[PDB]
């Protein structure tokens, strides 16, 4: 079971592991839309109306 | 006469090879490997908590 050797290194040298907690974010960035668009969205009424 | 020349080539291997090894041959991975985890990497450990 040498996959997670590198696991081992992920405890003590754990950069990679706060690394992709945005990545996880990033696969939920388009439900990060909705939070766009409490933004961005509220321009598209800006030309709209 | 039994201890200086003990004293120098056999006990010799009874000290220098008794305080680093008689107990701890094994435990130089328990001593070194230690340290580089547990003492070296002792301040990366918080580079995860800080991150």
Known sequence: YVRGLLDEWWEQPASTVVDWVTVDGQSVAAWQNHVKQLLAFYDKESLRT | ?51
Do not use: Y
């Open chain 2, 1 to 51: 006469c039994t201890h200086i020349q003990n004293l120098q080539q056999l006990l010799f291997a009874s000290s220098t090879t008794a305080q680093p090894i008689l107990t701890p041959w094994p435990l130089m991975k328990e001593l070194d490997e230690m340290g580089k985890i547990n003492s070296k990497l002792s301040t990366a450990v918080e580079e995860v908590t800080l991150e």
